[PDB]
Design an enzyme around this catalytic site. Structure first.
Site, mmCIF file in Angstrom:
data_model
loop_
_atom_site.group_PDB
_atom_site.id
_atom_site.type_symbol
_atom_site.label_atom_id
_atom_site.label_comp_id
_atom_site.label_asym_id
_atom_site.label_seq_id
_atom_site.Cartn_x
_atom_site.Cartn_y
_atom_site.Cartn_z
ATOM 1 N N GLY A 22 2.790 -10.319 9.995
ATOM 2 C CA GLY A 22 3.574 -11.535 9.895
ATOM 3 C C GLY A 22 4.389 -11.685 8.628
ATOM 4 O O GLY A 22 5.372 -12.414 8.609
ATOM 5 N N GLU A 80 25.922 6.239 -0.875
ATOM 6 C CA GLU A 80 26.026 7.546 -0.263
ATOM 7 C C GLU A 80 25.182 7.731 0.968
ATOM 8 O O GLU A 80 25.512 8.583 1.764
ATOM 9 C CB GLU A 80 25.744 8.636 -1.276
ATOM 10 C CG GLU A 80 26.854 9.652 -1.236
ATOM 11 C CD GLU A 80 26.736 10.739 -2.278
ATOM 12 O OE1 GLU A 80 26.814 10.395 -3.480
ATOM 13 O OE2 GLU A 80 26.563 11.925 -1.894
ATOM 14 N N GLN A 110 0.793 -1.235 0.000
ATOM 15 C CA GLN A 110 0.000 0.000 0.000
ATOM 16 C C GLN A 110 0.833 1.296 0.000
ATOM 17 O O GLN A 110 0.450 2.251 -0.670
ATOM 18 C CB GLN A 110 -1.037 -0.004 1.129
ATOM 19 C CG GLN A 110 -2.065 -1.097 0.866
ATOM 20 C CD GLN A 110 -3.429 -0.953 1.493
ATOM 21 O OE1 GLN A 110 -4.434 -1.266 0.866
ATOM 22 N NE2 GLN A 110 -3.509 -0.523 2.751
ATOM 23 N N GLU A 119 2.253 -7.398 17.815
ATOM 24 C CA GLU A 119 3.131 -6.508 17.044
ATOM 25 C C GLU A 119 4.486 -6.210 17.699
ATOM 26 O O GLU A 119 5.487 -6.270 16.981
ATOM 27 C CB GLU A 119 2.427 -5.221 16.657
ATOM 28 C CG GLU A 119 1.213 -5.482 15.805
ATOM 29 C CD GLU A 119 0.760 -4.268 15.025
ATOM 30 O OE1 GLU A 119 -0.467 -4.114 14.815
ATOM 31 O OE2 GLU A 119 1.640 -3.478 14.613
#
Ligand SMILES: Nc1nc2c(ncn2[C@@H]2O[C@H](COP(=O)(O)OP(=O)(O)OP(=O)(O)O)[C@@H](O)[C@H]2O)c(=O)[nH]1
Ligand SMILES: Nc1nc2c(ncn2[C@@H]2O[C@H](COP(=O)(O)OP(=O)(O)O)[C@@H](O)[C@H]2O)c(=O)[nH]1
Ligand SMILES: [Mg+2]
EC number: 3.6.5.-
Lengths: 438, 157, 424, 36
Positions: free
Chosen positions: A144, A254, A15, A183
């Site tokens: 997950g 960089e 998304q 989470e």
């Protein structure tokens, strides 16, 4: 010449990557089919966008992107949406069953069935590169697939593409949009195993984005659509240097040279300004002095923390728009004097600067106003350890009672993997404490 | 015609105004902007310089050939490589020897830009210069001369 | 993707029918099987419970099982009777006689072979079978005895697949051996199910004469069907939170043995009534024991994990403010060692008739009061070894009753362990 | 079928049963932990 391949893993990864590619096209003059007609293009001659877009014989520019998800509903929207003809079907990879917010299912059980096809599709992209620089990996921490499959893919990319840089965009959890109680577990597990594989990781705190949306964009109850619109605007500020002619952060190499002096401490903080509501009443365009000052307000950061209780290792400012170098030198002098910013002892104190004169771009119709000049500050502060500590404390609370651990154990992961990852996190907290000593 | 307004903006005190005037002078490819963009090639700012180099390729005026060959010595890698692609677009055989030397540049993009500009110029100066380079030269210049000769043969052999 | 439903026993089939009548109205599927709905949101996740038949026909992924013919003839008669697949009606002509030992080893083992065949037929149609859903009572013979047998057979053939139950807990408020079958069933439930929704009959009766004179079976079933539609909204409609059976269990079950949930529903409605409940009014009732489907008080126990579902059109910001206030004002009843344990979901579609509702699913340690009642009722009949000859003769083991009663007492001992657990 | 209608009786029924009046393996406690 020197290409970058972007990989989007899981719902959040796919998304946000879709919102980024939408903005890239708008910035470069690329239509949803892939065409770059004379009318749509910037007549400056800048072809640096070829590092993110390949070209066909028919003049179709195709994102060097791979989208992976263990469940098809998110990627099916990419296949059907506006940009259905921007990507080749081969670049959109879906499983049938997702990792059910379990790091172990994405890394071990389910992830192992799709890892070789993902590497095959990535190799197909890599084969078209005359001088591939490396990868930009977009994923959540809390899911997950975004946690588990990403660490599995990262482990394997290191082997198959040894000398190549790996930059992450990690979606750091927040309670306002949390879908799982586990989470903190997934977040700590993906950090430990990915740590030595990534060269630079940009954390996106969902709470910081939520606060900016409510406060600067006046969105009452922000949804993923609102969040991904601001996330993509910011992430595109960080990646611009790679897609346009410039003098700073022009290659993935960089990013460590300018932002990462110590390899484990590779999490720069990004601060974007100005975030203006398309619905706001007339205001005078904010000056270089004003936008440079906003860079030091912790409310403008995409990670919730305070650099005023912390030290710097690196600081980069990437300006876009009507930005006069003399006005930037003058504004940076004001920050170097009237501001009390403290560097770590063995790093130079200079602020690196980049100015791209092309006007800033927003998506027509969205929540954001079209500004005359913008800035993205990338800074490696020790203060970012606050975000680590918050995840660690929540991890400690549940792991103290072995709550939900059984789910991970019964899915191919060993119990000792929890404590080993938490040890690596405790060591990373100490690393941040060691570099900040006086 | 906003050409006169954009020409005056090329000498503006603000570097992003000078830049956006060069971008716009390239889109409005007018002969009235040849001397002005040749001067913007001596700009202090590399970003204005590199844009003036592209805008001069677009107009394709023979007047831009000698200052685009000086721009091949420029300190900045974008100015060298965009000046090379501009000289490839103009197709003047006056750029054959400075583009062959640009094959030895430390910048990869400058080498590729010069190799491709030589192939876009073509003709007998490039034919003769590649025949010589594919026998007496080495490295990138040698592969470029060999590739030029292989893609230009009228027979299978 | 697909949920295979099984309805064992007279209660399992009675509640199973009321479940299908409520979800079929919600999805727009008429009693014949054709789509008479109006929005594409009803069909986006129709494959979870329905199979696409010849034409626009949709057949429920349901298997109807009972050792008595009476419930199969009553399911056929009435609304949506002609929507079930004819070959999915597995009914024996013998009966259970209300014994767990008869249903698990004697008459159950004879019919379970043919039931598993129908299970295989529907699981073979599946693109990615999610798991199983069983509706059953725990005081009878077919539902409690043959139900726990069907769970163990499926757990061996489909070990990864999520097993879910809607387990009716018996209450005396007329069968002598009701707590014997219930104590033996709960023993199986601890080891073989992943999610067990305890639908206490005592709570249904108390919420029908104290809150809502003589309640009927359909009156208790009305509260059951309004609960079943709420707890399954996340599976039947597009959503972010607990969209599948595994994602729900990974957020709701912290310890494998502790997967016994407390359902809740607001507002309380009777079977045939003529106010539009607000978000703050819905929130207090969502956490009140007067609105619980299990006869327990959550103020006596701590919530380990909670799941709240709001249905209908309302402010998402108002639900945020009310859900934060219900967790801040009562943080004394929440677990400190399980951060952000309460997850809230909002569905735009309202339930049948009402315009706004709140369905609660809580894994609280206060449920040990329901299991305490069953231990106090089973040991009353086990104090003098009452009617054990009805289950002994069926072939059951002596130490089987001693293991079912000890495993349930261990579950209560584990619930008090995690209730007195300080995070500090 | 929605019209189906609804302690010391147990003590008296226990005394009434006293006037009138192939070991099958059962489930083990802890066997549910084997799936993790
Ligand atoms: N910013 C943002 N966060 C998102 C989005 N989708 C999910 N998240 C966040 O990401 C986390 C959940 O991870 P997901 O990306 O949905 O999970 P996944 O990688 O698909 O993992 P599984 O679904 O379990 O296989 C939570 O912290 C969510 O708040 C999105 O579009 N934008
Ligand atoms: N809610 C509800 N409970 C019922 C119904 N019929 C029976 N019960 C309960 O189910 C238990 C008896 O089990 P039952 O299903 O009749 O026996 P079985 O056919 O042998 O499984 C008791 O606890 C009853 O109160 C019903 O229609 N609704
Ligand atoms: Mg997902």
């Amino acid at each position: 010449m020197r290409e970058c391949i972007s990989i989007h893993v899981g719902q959040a990864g796919v998304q946000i990557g879709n919102a980024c590619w939408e903005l890239y096209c708008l910035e470069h003059g690329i239509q949803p089919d892939g065409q770059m007609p004379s009318d749509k293009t910037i007549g400056g001659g800048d072809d640096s966008f070829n590092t993110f877009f390949s070209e066909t014989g028919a003049g179709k520019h195709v994102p060097r992107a791979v989208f992976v998800d263990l469940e098809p509903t998110v990627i099916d929207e990419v296949r059907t949406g506006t940009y259905r003809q921007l990507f080749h079907p081969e670049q959109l990879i879906t499983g049938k069953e997702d990792a059910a917010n379990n790091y172990a299912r994405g890394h071990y059980t389910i992830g192992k069935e799709i890892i070789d096809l993902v590497l095959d599709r990535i190799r197909k992209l890599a084969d078209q590169c005359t001088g591939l620089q490396g990868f930009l990996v977009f994923h959540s921490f809390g899911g997950g697939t975004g946690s588990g499959f990403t660490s599995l893919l990262m482990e394997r990319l290191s082997v198959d593409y040894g000398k190549k840089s790996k930059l992450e965009f990690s979606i750091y959890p927040a309670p306002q949009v949390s879908t799982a109680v586990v989470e903190p577990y997934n977040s700590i597990l993906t950090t430990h195993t990915t740590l030595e594989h990534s060269d630079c990781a940009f954390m996106v705190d969902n709470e910081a984005i939520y606060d900016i949306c409510r406060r600067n964009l006046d969105i009452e109850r922000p949804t993923y659509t609102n969040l991904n619109r601001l996330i993509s605007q910011i992430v595109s500020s960080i990646t611009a240097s790679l897609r346009f002619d410039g003098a700073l952060n022009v290659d993935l190499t960089e990013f460590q040279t300018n932002l990462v002096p110590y390899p484990r401490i590779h999490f720069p903080l990004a601060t974007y300004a100005p975030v203006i509501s398309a619905e706001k009443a007339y205001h005078e365009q904010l000056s270089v002095a004003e936008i440079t000052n906003a860079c030091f307000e912790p409310a403008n950061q995409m990670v919730k923390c305070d650099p005023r209780h912390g030290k710097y290792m690196a600081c980069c400012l990437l300006y876009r728009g009507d930005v006069v170098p003399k006005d930037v030198n003058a504004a940076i002098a004001t920050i170097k004097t009237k501001r009390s910013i403290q560097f770590v002892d063995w790093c130079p104190t200079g602020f690196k600067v980049g100015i791209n004169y092309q006007p800033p771009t927003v998506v027509p119709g969205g929540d954001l106003a079209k500004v005359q000049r913008a800035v993205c500050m990338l800074s490696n502060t020790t203060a970012i350890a606050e975000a680590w500590a918050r995840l660690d404390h929540k991890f400690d609370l549940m792991y103290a009672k072995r709550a939900f651990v059984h789910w991970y154990v019964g899915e191919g992961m060993e119990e000792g993997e929890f404590s080993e990852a938490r040890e690596d996190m405790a060591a990373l907290e100490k690393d941040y404490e060691e570099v900040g000593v006086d | 015609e906003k050409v006169e307004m954009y020409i005056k903006n090329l000498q503006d005190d603000s570097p992003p105004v000078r830049f956006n005037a060069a971008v716009a002078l390239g889109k409005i490819g007018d002969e009235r902007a040849v001397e002005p963009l040749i001067k913007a090639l001596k700009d202090e700012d590399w970003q204005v310089r590199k844009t003036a180099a592209y805008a001069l390729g677009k107009i394709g005026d023979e007047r831009a050939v000698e200052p685009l060959i000086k721009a091949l010595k420029d300190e900045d890698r974008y100015v060298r490589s965009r000046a090379a692609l501009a000289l490839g677009k103009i197709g003047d055989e006056r750029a054959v020897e400075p583009l062959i030397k640009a094959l030895k540049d430390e910048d990869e993009y400058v080498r590729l830009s010069a190799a491709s500009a030589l192939g876009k110029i073509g003709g007998e100066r490039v034919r003769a210069a590649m025949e010589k380079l594919a026998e007496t030269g080495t490295g990138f210049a040698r592969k470029v001369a060999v590739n030029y000769l292989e893609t230009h043969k009228s027979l299978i052999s | 993707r697909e949920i295979v439903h099984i309805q064992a026993g007279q209660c399992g089939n009675q509640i199973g029918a009321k479940f299908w009548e409520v979800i079929s109205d919600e999805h727009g599927i008429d009693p014949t099987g054709s789509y008479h709905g109006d929005s594409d949101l009803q069909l986006e996740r129709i494959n979870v419970y329905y199979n696409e038949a010849t034409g626009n026909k949709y057949v429920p992924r349901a298997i109807l099982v009972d050792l008595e013919p009476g419930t199969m003839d009553s399911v056929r008669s009435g609304p949506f009777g002609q929507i079930f697949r004819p070959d999915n009606f597995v009914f024996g002509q013998s009966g259970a006689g209300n014994n767990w030992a008869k249903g698990h080893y004697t008459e159950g083992a004879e019919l379970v072979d043919s039931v598993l065949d129908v299970v295989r037929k529907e699981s073979e149609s599946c693109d990615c079978l999610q798991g199983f859903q069983l509706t059953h009572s725990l005081g009878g013979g077919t539902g409690s005895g043959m139900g726990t047998l069907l769970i163990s057979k499926i757990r061996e053939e489909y070990p990864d697949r999520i097993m879910n139950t809607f387990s009716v807990m018996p209450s005396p408020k007329d069968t002598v051996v009701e707590p014997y079958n219930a104590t033996l069933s709960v023993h199986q439930l601890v080891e073989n199910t992943d999610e067990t929704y305890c639908i206490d009959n005592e709570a249904l009766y108390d919420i029908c004469f104290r809150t809502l004179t003589t309640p009927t079976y359909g009156d208790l079933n009305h509260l059951v069907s309004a609960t079943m539609s709420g707890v399954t909204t996340c599976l039947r409609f597009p959503g972010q939170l607990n969209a599948d059976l595994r994602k729900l269990a990974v957020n709701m079950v912290p310890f494998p043995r502790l997967h016994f949930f407390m359902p809740g529903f607001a507002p309380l409605t009777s079977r045939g009534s003529q106010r539009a409940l607000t978000v703050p009014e819905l929130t207090q009732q969502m956490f009140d024991s007067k609105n619980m489907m299990a006869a327990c008080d959550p103020r006596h126990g701590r919530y380990l994990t909670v799941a709240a579902i709001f249905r209908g059109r309302m402010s998402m910001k108002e639900v945020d403010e009310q859900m934060l206030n219900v967790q801040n004002k009562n943080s004394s009843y929440f677990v400190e060692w399980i951060p952000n344990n309460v997850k809230t979901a909002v569905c735009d579609i309202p339930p049948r008739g009402l315009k706004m509702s709140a369905t609660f699913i809580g894994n609280s340690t206060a449920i040990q009061e329901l299991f305490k009642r069953i231990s106090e009722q089973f040991t009353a009949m086990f104090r003098r070894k009452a009617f054990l000859h009805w289950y002994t003769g069926e072939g059951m083991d002596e130490m089987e009753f001693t293991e079912a009663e000890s495993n349930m007492n261990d579950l209560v001992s584990e619930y008090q362990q995690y209730q007195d657990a300080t995070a500090d | 079928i929605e019209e189906r209608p609804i302690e010391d009786y147990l003590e008296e029924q226990i005394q009434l049963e006293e006037q009138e009046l192939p070991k099958q393996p059962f489930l083990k406690r802890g066997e549910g932990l084997a799936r993790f």
